[PDB]
From a paper:
MbtI converts chorismate to salicylate via a two-step mechanism, with the release of pyruvate. MbtI is known to exist in two possible conformations, generally referred to as “open” and “closed”, depending on the position of two flexible loops relative to the active site, as extensively analyzed in our previous work.
In the context of our efforts to elucidate the binding mode of 5-phenylfuran-2-carboxylic acids to MbtI, we obtained co-crystals with 5-(3-carboxyphenyl)furan-2-carboxylic acid (II). Despite its modest inhibitory activity in vitro (IC50: 35.2 ± 2.6 μM; residual activity at 100 μM: 27.2% ± 4.5), the compound was chosen as part of a large panel of crystallization trials. In the case of MbtI-II, loop stabilization may have contributed to improve the overall resolution of the crystallographic data (up to 1.6 Å), leading to a significantly higher value than the one obtained for the MbtI-I dataset. Moreover, the electron density map for the active site region was clearly interpretable in all its parts, effectively providing a complete picture of the active site region around the ligand. In agreement with this hypothesis, the analysis of the ligand pose revealed the presence of an H-bond between the carboxylic group at position 3 of the phenyl and the main chain amide of Gly270. The binding mode of the compound was equivalent in the two MbtI protomers. Finally, the carboxylic substituent on the phenyl ring formed H-bonds with Gly270 (as previously mentioned) and two ordered water molecules; one of them established a further interaction with the hydroxyl group of Thr271, while the other did so with the amine of Lys205. In our previous work, we speculated that the superior activity of I could be due to its ability to strongly bind this amino acid through its cyano group. This hypothesis is consistent with the present structure, which suggests a weaker interaction between compound II and MbtI Lys205, as evinced by the presence of an H-bond interaction between the ligand carboxylic group and the lysine ε-amino group, but a higher C-N distance (~3.20 Å) than that observed in the MbtI-I complex (2.29–2.82 Å over the four chains of the ASU).
Author numbering: 13 to 450
């Protein structure tokens, strides 16, 4: 099905070649794109053939300057799903992002959103370039894209420049104070856990593809992305899989809970791993989160199909390590891939426990709308597939402002100073790897 298949050159890693190709194609064609890494394939979705924009109050489908603009009601997953299924009648895959705000409708909180709040942006690409350890496959590539790959193979990948440091120690948004307020709300019995966050400004412009390459070779995320889409530049090393739906009907979700530092050498990392695996506080939070995922997944699964296939094992994520479980079910004939995403979104590590009360608290105690942060980056296929990675450990550039964003799960025993240090550990997935724009 690919019109070209080129063997991967010796000594070149696919993440490096795919991100370099995104830079070369940017220079020659100047188009929007989304690069998504999923199970050893880096798929560069290049150019926008058609775009679906789901907002809180409207749905727009834009193709070649022509817009279908429609009011929508009911579930946001049905509005997005109907438009995306339409894109996939004539193309194999669609890609994009879903905001954290897409998940508030299931809890009846959508009236709290401001008008015109973005919920999702999903596009069908003009071209797809798939890069694996074995080969480069070209789908619907015109002469400029074919010549860009030829030029890159002739020159080889660029050497990544040295990175530039950033200060994460300032607290202009009062994260420590906001954690103290959440702790008091938890002590009052309003909820059990809430995830709060803070932004850190990057006071210099970064090169997104070079920063992506440098951070990727020091991280082991479950998925990753690099994009330039409708005025947003973003990259991330997604630590958690929100949902994967396969064409054969198998649904997977991989919740994480608990955090210890990682990357401090073998001896310190082993002590942190043994503490994480045996700490009552982390075990209880992980068990509650697995029980929550199983309750959610039963609403969309064939009866008796839900199962935990890997339980409470350490998942290494670069600057941090977490407890994780892999939950599997079979999609019920009465359900669909968007209803599976809606059942599992937002993740507990994006919201809290109970999830409804965590989302309500975020509207008051966090900077809203969150947008891409704690939402998902997605890949959908014409055969029914869906892959949705949780957007944490990401960097953004919008309108000349570059920033990072990290948070923490706050419970009754949380201390503001420790939670602030925890956001610093999560920021460390990116802060040593920022390449300035040259
Ligand atoms: O609540 C937990 O146990 C838990 C576990 C792993 C991650 C997170 C979490 C919340 C926000 C971020 C981030 O901005 O990266 O990460 C929370």
């Amino acid at each position: 099905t690919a019109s070209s298949s080129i063997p991967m050159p010796a000594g070149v890693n696919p993440a490096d070649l795919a991100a370099e190709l995104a830079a070369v194609v940017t220079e020659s064609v100047d188009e929007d794109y989304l690069l998504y890494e999923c199970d050893g394939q880096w798929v560069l979705a290049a150019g926008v053939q058609a775009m679906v924009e789901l907002d809180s109050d409207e749905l727009r489908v834009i193709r070649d300057g022509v817009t279908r603009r429609q009011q929508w009601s009911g579930r946001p997953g049905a509005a997005l799903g109907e438009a995306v299924d339409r894109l996939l009648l004539e193309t194999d895959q669609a890609f994009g992002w879903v905001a954290f705000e897409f998940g508030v409708h299931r809890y009846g909180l959508q009236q709290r959103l401001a008008p015109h709040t973005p919920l999702a942006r999903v596009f069908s690409p003009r071209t797809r370039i798939m890069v694996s350890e074995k080969e480069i496959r070209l789908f619907d590539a015109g002469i400029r894209h074919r010549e860009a790959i030829d030029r890159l193979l002739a020159t080889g990948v660029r050497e990544v420049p040295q990175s530039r440091s950033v200060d994460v120690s300032d607290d202009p948004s009062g994260f420590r104070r906001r954690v103290a307020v959440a702790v008091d709300e938890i002590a009052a019995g309003r909820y059990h856990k809430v995830i709060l966050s803070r932004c850190v400004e990057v006071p210099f412009a970064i090169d997104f593809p070079l920063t992506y390459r440098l951070g990727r070779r020091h991280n082991t995320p479950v998925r990753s992305f690099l994009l330039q889409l409708g005025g947003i530049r973003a990259l991330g090393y997604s630590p958690e899989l929100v949902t994967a739906v396969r064409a054969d009907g198998v649904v997977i979700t991989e919740p994480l809970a608990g955090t210890r530092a990682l990357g401090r050498g073998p001896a310190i990392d082993r002590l942190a791993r043994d503490d994480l695996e045996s700490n009552s506080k982390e075990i209880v939070e992980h068990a509650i989160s697995v029980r929550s995922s199983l309750e959610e997944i039963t609403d969309i699964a064939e009866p008796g199909s839900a199962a935990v296939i890997d339980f409470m094992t350490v998942r290494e994520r670069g600057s941090v390590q977490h407890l994780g479980s892999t939950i599997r079910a079979r999609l019920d004939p009465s359900s669909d891939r968007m209803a599976a995403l809606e059942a599992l979104f937002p993740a507990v590590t994006a919201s809290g426990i109970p999830k409804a009360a965590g989302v309500e608290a975020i509207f008051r105690l966090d900077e809203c709308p969150r947008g891409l942060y704690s939402g998902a980056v997605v890949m959908l296929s014409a055969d029914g597939g869906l892959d949705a990675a949780l957007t944490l450990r990401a960097a953004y550039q919008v309108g000349g402002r570059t920033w990072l964003r990290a948070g923490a799960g706050i419970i009754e025993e949380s201390e503001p100073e420790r939670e602030f240090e925890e956001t610093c550990e999560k920021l460390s997935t990116l802060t040593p790897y920022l390449v300035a724009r040259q």
